[PDB]
Amino acid sequence: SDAVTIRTRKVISNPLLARKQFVVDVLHPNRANVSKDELREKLAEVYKAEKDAVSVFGFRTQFGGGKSVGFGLVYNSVAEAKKFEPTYRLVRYGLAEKVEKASRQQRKQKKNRDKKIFGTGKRLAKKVARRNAD
Amino acid sequence: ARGPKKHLKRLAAPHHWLLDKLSGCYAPRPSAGPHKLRESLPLIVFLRNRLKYALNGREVKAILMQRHVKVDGKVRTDTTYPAGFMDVITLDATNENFRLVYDVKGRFAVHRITDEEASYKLGKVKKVQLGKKGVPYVVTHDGRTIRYPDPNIKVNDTVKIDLASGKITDFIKFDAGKLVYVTGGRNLGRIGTIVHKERHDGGFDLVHIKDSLDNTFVTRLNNVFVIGEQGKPYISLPKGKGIKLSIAEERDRRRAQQGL
Amino acid sequence: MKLNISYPVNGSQKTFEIDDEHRIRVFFDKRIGQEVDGEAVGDEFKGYVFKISGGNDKQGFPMKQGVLLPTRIKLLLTKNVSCYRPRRDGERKRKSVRGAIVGPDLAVLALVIVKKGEQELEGLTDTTVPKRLGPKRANNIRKFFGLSKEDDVRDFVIRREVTKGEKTYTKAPKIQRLVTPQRLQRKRHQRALKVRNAQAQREAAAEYAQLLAKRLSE
RNA sequence: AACUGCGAAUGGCUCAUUAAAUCAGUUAUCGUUUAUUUGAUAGUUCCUUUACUACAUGGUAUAACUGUGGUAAUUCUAGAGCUA
RNA sequence: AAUAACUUUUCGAAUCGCAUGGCCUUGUGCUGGCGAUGGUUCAUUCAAAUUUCUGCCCUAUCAACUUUCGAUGGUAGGAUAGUGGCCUACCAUGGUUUCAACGGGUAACGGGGAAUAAGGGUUCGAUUCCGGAGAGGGAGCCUGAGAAACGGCUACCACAUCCAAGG
Questions:
Q1: Domain-embedded: residue B236
Q2: Buried b (16+ CB within 10 A) or exposed e, C130-151
Q3: What are the backbone dihedrals phi and psi of residue C188, each rounded to the nearest 5 degrees, phi first?
Q4: Where is this region: Disordered (chain A)?
Q5: Helical ranges in chain C per DSSP H
Q6: Domain count across chain B
Q7: How far is CA A68 from CA A7, A18, A24, A37, A46, in A?
Q8: Which phi and psi angles does C202 have, rounded to 5°?
Q9: Nearest-CA residue of chain B relative to A72?
Q10: C-alpha C8: how far from chain center
Q11: Best interface-test mutation with A: which of B47, B66, B97, B98 has the largest number of A CBs within 10 A?
Q12: Checking phi first, is residue B95 left (phi over 0); if not, alpha (psi -120 to 50) or beta?
């Protein structure tokens, strides 16, 4: 845990996506792994991006340890880091909220059930309730 | 089977797109457009695989729906639009203009041009008809129709067309001593001179092409695109100027330039 | 059987149940569209004439007009034909359907009142059910109020009040086929684009004839 | 919600039929159809051309909806009202 | 392209969104931007349907097949998106074959390819790609640009489900 070194390779500026994209090459010669959150802290300092315009997602520790490589994004103007990021990668960082829905089984079973009716459905519910009531 | 197909599989895509074997079961499947899908380039392949400006197919559409990409001076928004030979793709956000033009290995090159020479292109004429109301026209190699051409324009000439207006500026005839560009076959992406053209009544006239290094090869007439006089082209040219080094020299150029 | 009598002038509906064989038998051997005088149906039904309109048999199969020989028969049914809603376009189906002549196998039967007599029915004639929507297209609102061709029908639209619990806000249809300055701009622009396009082709044709006349100097 | 428009002819599965058949390479369409894409493309619409006809823009006819029902039953539907 | 005509008279915008600007003869005056949908014809693209040449395993324990209920060709018509015996009427007697026709078999979808590796070969290829065919069998069709479609429709049989027995 002596030191970690952030080396950003292959830096390409992306004006038409309002971002900067590069290969993150971290050298952690005594750490076990490097834990993306404080990479987002440390990459914020070298690019002035307040930890919400940055994203790191693809890391792979080299065999034998001591080195890991992944990809990294740095955005302009965090409002544009929610415009262009995928939703799954925002919820890792807590910017977006994990939207709740049922499984694909229920979401498909409901559609097939709702495909049988024709219209609002509350014209038929009125006339079937009176037969059930009497 | 019962109608036109909509899918395209990897291992069936054109080889000059350089899609990898694994990492996908399908291929971009170019839409209908100006260029035949065997000899065209989808916009997703050009902005994700060539420029590396995108990491997914999802954010190619994110790029495209912002009306950033113009093909031939008009904004085009479909992901798999068929961009092809001498298409003038311009990204105004980066102020980068490109012209699609072939490598000497048959691939499409990332050929970056200036703001001028991004305002015209060249199209080889396919046929010169006389349309109704007595109005003649030409059609070019990308399906553009231009009415009222100069009456000295015949088939296999190239034609310089403005992109803002679609009109026809000065042209180049087809005879010996003109620079060419080979657009299909074994010699795809090679640049030479007309010097002999073999007529064959009944099909497939052949042209003998001589490049600057005094080599000579033969292609069909329909793989030949004249691009101006000898030593005076009408466009910029890629690295190497279409020269077809053999594998012995390419081993030599690589290792000499690897270091220093 | 059972009866569904509808009074269209007032727009009211009510179902009656009659078990008398002698009153039912008048309905027999009658096709849909044939009028039936109601004085044989009941003491309250003097003065009424009823037109037979439809109904269902004891298994639910509806009767159909023109389908004489009153027994269940299967027909190949297509679009724009009753007793069938096509699930996909171009589809046609073979379904059971019941004949037009009234018989003793009908579970219900539907009737309309053509002319009102002297007598009064409490459930069908006094009560009123109003029209659900007013006219929406511009001329349909003009002739509904008997308006002339200049009366600016924008302020004569039927306007329903809606209150959440305490706020009366009113909502109206968007008048279709309404003459607007936007519609006049669109007509002007398309009309001008036709003349401007036509002049440009006459100029390009005239310029080309100048070029050919120049080439005849040689 | 429903009408309108498009798609559902792609995909995926299998190898039963099939022995000049399929298919492979190579041709032709001066022997044809082609939604879509792309580029072009449309001053003529009227009446023996004066009593002329809406062009500041013509007509009903239905869904959805309201209301009354049938059937043990199904992506079953009838009669009556309204409105694009 | 021109002439003379013909037509259940095809098309020639009664559609939508953001903007809202310029001129005086102050009228909801006259003009006026960007772009969505549509529309005739032509070209292009995505195709499709026909089509030329050559090429397929075992069998003579299959040597003569095909015409008359089209077999080979001609003329005219019908039909088709179109060519064509594709069908019809009339007419002629052709067409294929020991260089293997025709018939039979195949535990036969064809190809790229796979296995074995001196050379030459032998055996396999239902199956990651291309093409074809089919959706329990066989016909017939609606819609559409495109289907003889089957997660479309019209009745069967190896069939088979539900019940209030009517469907």
A1: yes
A2: eeeeebeebeebbeeeeeeeee
A3: -65, -45
A4: 101-134
A5: 21-24, 138-142, 181-215
A6: 3
A7: 11, 27, 8, 15, 19
A8: -75, -30
A9: B55
A10: 14
A11: B66
A12: left
Give the Cα separation of A58 and A41 in Å (integer): 17
Tell me which chain A residues have a C-beta less than 8 angstroms from the C-beta of B63.
Answer: 16-17
* 3-class secondary-structure state, position C131: coil
User: Which chain C residues are within 8 Å of B150, Cβ to Cβ?
Assistant: 211
Query: Which residue, B74, B124, B72, is CA-closest to B100?
Result: B72
Q: Mark yes or no for CB contact A16/B94 under 8 Å.
A: yes
Asked if B183 and B167 sit in the same domain, the reply is: no
Give the nucleotide nearest to B142 (CA→C1'). E44
Q: Å from C90 (CA) to E136 (C1')?
A: 26
Please name the residues in contact with C111: beta carbons below 8 A apart, sequence gap of 6 or more. C3, C4, C5, C6, C36, C50, C51, C52, C53
* Single-letter code of the amino acid located at C25: R
Residue B200: which domain range? 174-244
Can you read off the two tokens belonging to residue B84?
């092809």
Together in a domain, B82 and B95: yes
Of A6, A45, A8, give the one whose Cα is nearest residue A28. A6
DSSP character string of C25-37: GGGTT--TT-EEE
Phi, psi (degrees; rounded to nearest 5) at A91: -75, -20
Q: What distance in Å separates the CA atoms of residue A112 and residue C19, rounded to the nearest whole number?
A: 43
Q: Which of B64, B94, B98 to mutate to test the interface with A (most CBs of A within 10 A)?
A: B94
* Same structural domain, B68 and B151: no
B76 and B165 housed in the same domain? no
Out of A16, A21, A86, the one facing B91 most closely (by C-beta) is A16
Using the Cβ of B150 and the Cβ atoms of chain C, whether some distance falls under 8 Å is answered with: yes
In a shared domain, residues B151 and B66: no
Instruction: Supply φ then ψ for residue C6, to 5 degrees.
Output: -115, 135
Strand D: which of residues 129-188 in chain C lie with Cβ below 7 A? 129, 131-140, 143-144, 149, 173, 176-177, 179, 181, 183-184, 186-187
CB C75 within 8 A of CB C67: yes
Task: Give the tokens for residue B70.
Answer: 């113009």
Cβ density class A47-74: b for 16+ within 10 Å, e for less:
bebeebbbbbeebebeeeeebbbbebbb
Cβ atoms within 10 Å of A111's Cβ, excluding its own: 9
Question: Burial code of B105-132, b = ≥16 C-beta within 10 A, e = fewer?
Answer: ebbbbebebeeeebebbbbbbeeeeeee
